[PDB]
Amino acid sequence: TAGRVVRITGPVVDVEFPRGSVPELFNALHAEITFGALAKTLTLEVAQHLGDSLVRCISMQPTDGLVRGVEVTDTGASISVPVGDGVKGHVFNALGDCLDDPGYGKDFEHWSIHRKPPAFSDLEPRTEMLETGLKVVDLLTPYVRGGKIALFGGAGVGKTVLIQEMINRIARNFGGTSVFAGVGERTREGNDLWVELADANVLKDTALVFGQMDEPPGTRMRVALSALTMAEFFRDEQGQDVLLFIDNIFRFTQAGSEVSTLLGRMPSAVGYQPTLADEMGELQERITSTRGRSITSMQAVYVPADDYTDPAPATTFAHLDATTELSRAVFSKGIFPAVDPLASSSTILDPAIVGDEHYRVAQEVIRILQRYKDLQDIIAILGIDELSEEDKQLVNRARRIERFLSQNMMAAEQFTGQPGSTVPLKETIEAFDKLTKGEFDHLPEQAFFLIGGLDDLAKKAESL
Amino acid sequence: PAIVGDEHYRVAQEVIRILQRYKDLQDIIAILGIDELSEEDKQLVNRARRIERFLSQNMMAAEQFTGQPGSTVPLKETIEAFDKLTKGEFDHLPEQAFFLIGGLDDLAKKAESL
Amino acid sequence: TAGRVVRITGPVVDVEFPRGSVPELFNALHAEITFGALAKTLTLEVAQHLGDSLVRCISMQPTDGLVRGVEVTDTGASISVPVGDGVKGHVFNALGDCLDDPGYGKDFEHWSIHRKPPAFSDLEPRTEMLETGLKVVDLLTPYVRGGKIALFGGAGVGKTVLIQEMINRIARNFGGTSVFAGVGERTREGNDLWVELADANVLKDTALVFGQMDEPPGTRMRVALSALTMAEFFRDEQGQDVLLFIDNIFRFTQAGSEVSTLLGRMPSAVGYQPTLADEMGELQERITSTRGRSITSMQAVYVPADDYTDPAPATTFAHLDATTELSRAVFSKGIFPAVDPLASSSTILDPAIVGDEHYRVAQEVIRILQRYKDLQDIIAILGIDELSEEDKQLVNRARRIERFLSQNMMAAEQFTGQPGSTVPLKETIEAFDKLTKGEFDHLPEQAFFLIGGLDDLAKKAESL
Amino acid sequence: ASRRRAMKSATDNADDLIKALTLAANRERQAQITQEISEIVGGANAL
Amino acid sequence: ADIEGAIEDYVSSFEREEIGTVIDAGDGIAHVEGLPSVMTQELLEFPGGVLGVALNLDEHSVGAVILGEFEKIEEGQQVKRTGEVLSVPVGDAFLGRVVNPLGQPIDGQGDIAAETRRALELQAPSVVQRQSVSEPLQTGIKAIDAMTPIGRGQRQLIIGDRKTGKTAVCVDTILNQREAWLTGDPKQQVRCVYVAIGQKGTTIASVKRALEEGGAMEYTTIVAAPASDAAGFKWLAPYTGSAIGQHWMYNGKHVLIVFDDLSKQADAYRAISLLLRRPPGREAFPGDVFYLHSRLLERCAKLSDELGGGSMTGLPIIETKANDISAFIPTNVISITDGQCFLESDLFNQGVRPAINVGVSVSRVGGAAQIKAMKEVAGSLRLDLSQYRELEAFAAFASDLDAASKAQLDRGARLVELLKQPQYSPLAVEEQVVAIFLGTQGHLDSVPVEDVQRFESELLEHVKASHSDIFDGIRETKKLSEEAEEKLVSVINEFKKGFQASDGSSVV
Amino acid sequence: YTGSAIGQHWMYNGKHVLIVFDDLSKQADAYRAISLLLRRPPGREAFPG
Amino acid sequence: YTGSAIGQHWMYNGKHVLIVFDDLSKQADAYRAISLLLRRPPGREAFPGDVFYLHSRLLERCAKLSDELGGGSMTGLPIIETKANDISAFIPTNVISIT
Amino acid sequence: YRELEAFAAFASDLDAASKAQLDRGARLVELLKQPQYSPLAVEEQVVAIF
Ligand SMILES: Nc1ncnc2c1ncn2[C@@H]1O[C@H](COP(=O)(O)OP(=O)(O)OP(=O)(O)O)[C@@H](O)[C@H]1O
Numbered sequence A, C: 001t002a003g004r005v006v007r008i009t010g011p012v013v014d015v016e017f018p019r020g021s022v023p024e025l026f027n028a029l030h031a032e033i034t035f036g037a038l039a040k041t042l043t044l045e046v047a048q049h050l051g052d053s054l055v056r057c058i059s060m061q062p063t064d065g066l067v068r069g070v071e072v073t074d075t076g077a078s079i080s081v082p083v084g085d086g087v088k089g090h091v092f093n094a095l096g097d098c099l100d101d102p103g104y105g106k107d108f109e110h111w112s113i114h115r116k117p118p119a120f121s122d123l124e125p126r127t128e129m130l131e132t133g134l135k136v137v138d139l140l141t142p143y144v145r146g147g148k149i150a151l152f153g154g155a156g157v158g159k160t161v162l163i164q165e166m167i168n169r170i171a172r173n174f175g176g177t178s179v180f181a182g183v184g185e186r187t188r189e190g191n192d193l194w195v196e197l198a199d200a201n202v203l204k205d206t207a208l209v210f211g212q213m214d215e216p217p218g219t220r221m222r223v224a225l226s227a228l229t230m231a232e233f234f235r236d237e238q239g240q241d242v243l244l245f246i247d248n249i250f251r252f253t254q255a256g257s258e259v260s261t262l263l264g265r266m267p268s269a270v271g272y273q274p275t276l277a278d279e280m281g282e283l284q285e286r287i288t289s290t291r292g293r294s295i296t297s298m299q300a301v302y303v304p305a306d307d308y309t310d311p312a313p314a315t316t317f318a319h320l321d322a323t324t325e326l327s328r329a330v331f332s333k334g335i336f337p338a339v340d341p342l343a344s345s346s347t348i349l350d351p352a353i354v355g356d357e358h359y360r361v362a363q364e365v366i367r368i369l370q371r372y373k374d375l376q377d378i379i380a381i382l383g384i385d386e387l388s389e390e391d392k393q394l395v396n397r398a399r400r401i402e403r404f405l406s407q408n409m410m411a412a413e414q415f416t417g418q419p420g421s422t423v424p425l426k427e428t429i430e431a432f433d434k435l436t437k438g439e440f441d442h443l444p445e446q447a448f449f450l451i452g453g454l455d456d457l458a459k460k461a462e463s464l
Numbered sequence B: 001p002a003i004v005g006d007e008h009y010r011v012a013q014e015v016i017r018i019l020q021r022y023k024d025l026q027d028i029i030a031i032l033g034i035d036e037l038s039e040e041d042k043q044l045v046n047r048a049r050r051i052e053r054f055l056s057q058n059m060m061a062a063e064q065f066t067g068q069p070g071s072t073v074p075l076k077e078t079i080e081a082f083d084k085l086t087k088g089e090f091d092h093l094p095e096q097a098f099f100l101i102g103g104l105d106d107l108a109k110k111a112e113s114l
Numbered sequence D: 001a002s003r004r005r006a007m008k009s010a011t012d013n014a015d016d017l018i019k020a021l022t023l024a025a026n027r028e029r030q031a032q033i034t035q036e037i038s039e040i041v042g043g044a045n046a047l
Numbered sequence E: 001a002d003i004e005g006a007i008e009d010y011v012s013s014f015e016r017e018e019i020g021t022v023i024d025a026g027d028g029i030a031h032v033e034g035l036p037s038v039m040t041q042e043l044l045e046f047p048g049g050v051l052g053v054a055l056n057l058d059e060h061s062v063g064a065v066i067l068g069e070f071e072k073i074e075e076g077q078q079v080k081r082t083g084e085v086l087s088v089p090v091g092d093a094f095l096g097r098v099v100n101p102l103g104q105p106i107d108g109q110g111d112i113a114a115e116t117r118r119a120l121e122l123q124a125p126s127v128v129q130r131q132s133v134s135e136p137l138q139t140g141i142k143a144i145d146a147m148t149p150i151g152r153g154q155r156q157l158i159i160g161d162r163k164t165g166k167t168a169v170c171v172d173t174i175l176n177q178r179e180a181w182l183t184g185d186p187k188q189q190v191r192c193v194y195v196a197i198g199q200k201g202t203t204i205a206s207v208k209r210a211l212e213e214g215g216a217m218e219y220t221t222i223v224a225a226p227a228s229d230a231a232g233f234k235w236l237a238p239y240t241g242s243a244i245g246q247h248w249m250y251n252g253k254h255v256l257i258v259f260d261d262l263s264k265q266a267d268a269y270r271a272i273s274l275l276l277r278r279p280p281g282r283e284a285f286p287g288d289v290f291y292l293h294s295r296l297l298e299r300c301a302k303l304s305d306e307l308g309g310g311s312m313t314g315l316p317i318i319e320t321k322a323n324d325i326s327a328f329i330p331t332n333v334i335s336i337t338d339g340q341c342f343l344e345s346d347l348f349n350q351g352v353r354p355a356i357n358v359g360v361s362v363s364r365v366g367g368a369a370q371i372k373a374m375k376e377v378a379g380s381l382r383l384d385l386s387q388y389r390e391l392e393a394f395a396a397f398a399s400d401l402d403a404a405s406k407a408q409l410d411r412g413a414r415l416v417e418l419l420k421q422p423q424y425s426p427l428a429v430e431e432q433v434v435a436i437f438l439g440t441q442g443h444l445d446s447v448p449v450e451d452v453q454r455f456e457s458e459l460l461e462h463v464k465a466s467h468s469d470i471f472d473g474i475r476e477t478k479k480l481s482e483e484a485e486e487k488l489v490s491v492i493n494e495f496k497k498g499f500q501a502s503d504g505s506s507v508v
Numbered sequence F: 001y002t003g004s005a006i007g008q009h010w011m012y013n014g015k016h017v018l019i020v021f022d023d024l025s026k027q028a029d030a031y032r033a034i035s036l037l038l039r040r041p042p043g044r045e046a047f048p049g
Numbered sequence G: 001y002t003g004s005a006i007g008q009h010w011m012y013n014g015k016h017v018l019i020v021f022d023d024l025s026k027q028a029d030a031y032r033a034i035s036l037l038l039r040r041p042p043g044r045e046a047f048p049g050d051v052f053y054l055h056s057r058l059l060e061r062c063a064k065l066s067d068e069l070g071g072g073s074m075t076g077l078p079i080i081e082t083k084a085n086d087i088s089a090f091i092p093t094n095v096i097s098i099t
Numbered sequence H: 001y002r003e004l005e006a007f008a009a010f011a012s013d014l015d016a017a018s019k020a021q022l023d024r025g026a027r028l029v030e031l032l033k034q035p036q037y038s039p040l041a042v043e044e045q046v047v048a049i050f
């Protein structure tokens, strides 16, 4: 019993099946394109039942060359991706086919990418910090174990270096793994990331899942779910903490909108799919902590027209627990990881969750940096000498505080050879308490660059 | 004017002129405030604010919210009071005297209070 | 073999034919309205073949009075218009019937109003300036002889006045043949143009084709083509230098929009027809001038909602060598003839064509005007007295330049009382060069308003 | 000193105005997109 | 019971030739009953020599977009299917020719000797098949090469409102490749394809004349789809150009593909989709317009050394309306592309030509696309320009600024003048290096602002005539050596004396 | 249109007429209502083409 | 609606109830999704004309019953998530007019 | 107090009455400030607002 293609309109394909064999929703059907130049095995995802035994499917690959009347075979299960430690060190597409080694992983355990999020009673009832070891992240924008982190930035602010640092830290400090869901990934950027991770030797610790831009909207929509299914396998079967990158999750929303438009569904407010919130929830709610093991996610979010009230970012930000904004200005000053201390924010920076001392120190640091940024306008025009003695003291202290937020990231070990530093949260809190009290303002500013804590601060001060 | 009379119409149109000129100056007031306005416009803005606040009244239905009893201003008194406002006869009183006061005698009483 | 009206919906009529006699697309069919008050022969233009031997046609005359089942005869050829030296000095409608002398062109050579544009091999770019005598046009929007020219404008900003002025300036001494196409413009302006041309003895060299806005969508679509067919006959079959004025070309596309939904097409953005660009491209590319055969075309382009981002103006912009853009903001400031000096452009405003002096003066004028436009926001609130001395001088010069770009046009005499004036190109360049260097900063700005030349500037300065 | 205070206040007021106008412009942009899509899909639904 | 079996047998029954019949025809679309074996995007041929692309395949009929000569299609006409999906000829014979999206010459010259035929919808180079963009593609524009460098294999969008200089930038990029072409080295030669979508024919002729006068036409192919052509040609033209480029790309050559403009590509595709009754989305575009542009642009790449090492650089052009970069198509192509050159009419009128809005313009490839000389010389250019745009509010009150801030403002004005460049006059990379060296190292500080543009143009010429050793050193080594820098400074100071400022001052 | 016809009758007999339409905006709304009730697909601003 | 039903059963039995809805804008979005999937033409902000009804139908049932009906009550604390303090949006204004 | 504080952010000086109002308003604001998950019985609220 096999189907038959009856309507082809771009990515949308309608398939008629015998009355007793109509596939259920989200099943993956296979069709053959036999034309020599475009020979392929189309993977169609059933989207709707049209009645009369017809099913409307979103083709995951270009339908060019497809012929009416061509046999369609039902796999009996939704798009299933490979899972296990085998997926580490390799790059896959949305459908589970390996790109860097075709045919690899076809015999691993295969998991459906359509999985319900954890039952209500399985969720953790209290938010827990993720001690990532970075001074800036731990102090000012503490991440959430099982939470979602916005990652703003671009080229030339070290976003890839930060991603490598987080992969290294999750792999080594927490003994976990990583999955990089390249939704709407530029093929050039995908190749660059693949080679960079291979050279940094972190590819062995992460599984890459690229839904390229040139692929039709179906794969760009389902690649996040595929990567998150790999992450779920690592969380629930291997018992490993996972860090799931989803760069860029606006492109997930956009692909969903495109698929909705293709299927003929009337657009919502700003042209987005009516089920926008439902789709974002289905993606994000699976990113959570359960049974003591969690999937954290760093999700670069594109904000169209810089409009945070737009339905796409507005829906995405209802799920994000922290924000890390990489600034070109901070990067130009040599302050890697390039996190903007002020424009970044976190929903855990509250005395209830973090320690009261932690909140006090972080707020003091934020106040000092805010005051310094306000004085920067005066400094850049009138000169540093025009300020008052209190202003000069605060400017020096803020310079040293912001430069101390830099760290010798593990991602830099490949270049400079200095082992990466993991600064405990307590040490960071006490160090920044001292910095804000001025106990270290007599050191040169160069002493605080790229040092992992107080002991390294003293050693570098002695070296200067 | 053929229905409400020459005086009522004249006072109403003068009030509307003052308020419209105040509305025109709104962006300048928002950015730089009354300080940069010309003296004519400065005086006009002062009495426009006073007029706008004097149009407020303590409604008898509002007693359930603010507890203040409500007033009723006869039409002749309204016309006279707004003629005086537009002529600047009250532009020395503080702006606060005109909120939710409803009348001339009540205006004087609240002016004494402040 | 003849058709039968099956379905009538406003200007769109469906006609059923015997299976062996379905008329081709763009053929002309003749139905008959027999009601006495509206009796006429109704010319339908086949627009679609919709199966079962049914064609769908756009009526040229109003369909009021048409009866279902009335016989529709097939002409076997598309709508044809008379061509030759005979059509000069006469007024025709879209269908080619003469207005001022009925039955005049019934025996001239007839050409179908539908033809492919000249082959790309025959196109040669035009780079010869056309001196108008208007300061703004000659300086910042220099027109092209043999090229395409546009007057973009919102509603009631003076497009018709300026195009009549352009006829007065270019066509009076033109040795060639003129063709004016009233495409859904105002009939009163058409009559004024007709009487003005008759008075000046330019009518004998001009053929007028009117499809004014009282007519239904079909005529407003095909009148542009009807006039352009006479223009093409004069270009090809006679080698005469041709002028082709069109007012208003947007009414073409708008007309297609009115029947777009009745023809069964899904509407594109802003309610326009999906074929907007294709139809307008065909019509506009027919207007080009082949090598050795010149059509100087000038088209008034209506800008709906004063929005230059509207699809119709935006698509038309790509078809033009020079674009005089009239704006309501300038018109409101009294600066007749309404030209926005910053939006308007020309492809021959390059130093290699108009000369170094002209280019420098024009571009300095644009620089001053752009700076003044940027400063307007500051001046309206902070006041001019808080500007830089250089910026204050620039603002004074910019006001003088804005007012000097105004001109007392011949067609605007009945708007200003004073007679028209002509400024030679050298005089315009000299006057604006002096203005830009500040040689007239001592004169009051009102002395530059509606003068047209340096002698008039001096006279009005004395009068003030 | 008074000019410094007045210009700081003016800059703050202009920044607040910029934020308010950006919010209004975003609302109008979203409303325009929604209205355009409503017109397009109304034309489509009627076929 | 037997009903299903007999129905299935009849369906299966549906080497003989397949001929369909047109049932509907209107607005560039023709519905063809029959053709049970037609494949999506197959090239159907209608009796009058007309061509169409089977684009909708319903159970009743096949909706085909007609590629020109639409009016010759009638109900009942016999339609024959060519068994080939859309394909275009490709070869070295397309250099110097103007072809329509089907590869048929429209310049009026002789036929084109096609080396092979490439399908328009072949897969783009996968992740495994590419290589990091590391070779510069010198556009000849100081702004682009110093601030937003384009490395061959990159996709640099040229985005901006009408009459802002986009086509000027792309044509200058094409013209700047003549020096590379004359080398005869396939590893330096950059072949060019200028795809024209919806431009009036005389504009295409003007671009061809600009390329011929500059001599570029001998390595450039123009895939012209003028507005006179059907929406089908305007939709296929970028793919025809991309296929012509890909044939060279997979043969080890480097290609520079210019789309002018992708907005009209999207408009034509929207028209076709709406006429095919496909559901519309935002701005009435079909749901797969982003897919259209991404499928087009991701062919641009730099192939791995296994695949010959060839590259294809895409310079798509987008005509934003009212400088709204947030419109649907601008947003899609900004997401797709690796960098953006934002051209603004406000800058263009201010005299910043070409009007690249530095600050908002960005290249994600970055310094990896610049030769080391340019990388070191232009490193301080961006910071200086940003500082200048911050200080510009203080130009009126320079007397009250710190000496450092005044120096920054004065340097920034001269850098802005330095980045100005006349049309159709691209600069070789060595000339650009020396020019930006003038500004960033302060050698323009003594020259009046209004003369900087002249001081550059003469000085470079002087060098080109007298001390070409510096240019040769930069070109051969790709880096500005220390002794070369000292020689250049000596030449700069020697020239300063002989340069006469327009205002009469002395520049030393 | 009724006002225009009444006026035109006098216009074509050599008499001068003045027609006030108060408001044509309300005619456009009524025509929109009629066209939508007849189920003509609308154009921009929901008005008929 | 199910929360209001659970509450109303207590309310009509003489019990005093408090109903919290975190958040009614997400109900409006869900109803918009359902309406658009049923192809009901949208209105302001893509919402159907029924959206106001949707909330009023819900928040009117929060009432202080008279002693004729047991004297029970159901207090409602609907939560609305404005976007950028835009209290003038469609759904915020609707709920303000209902509450 | 909200508008009074907005005015005082840039006013050079104000009457002793204005300063007293500002001082009272700051204290009322700091008083209505309340930690999460710490509801106060109605009598405790009465005493606090007292
Ligand atoms: N660097 C430059 N210096 C001076 N003028 C320039 C420069 N670049 C372009 N121009 C001029 O700007 C005008 C517009 O140029 P161009 O046609 O290349 O722009 P475009 O934005 O691509 O236009 P269109 O949208 O009409 O295709 C032309 O007059 C061109 O000569």
Ligand SMILES: [Mg+2]
Binding pocket: E166, E167, E168, E260
């Ligand atoms: Mg161009």
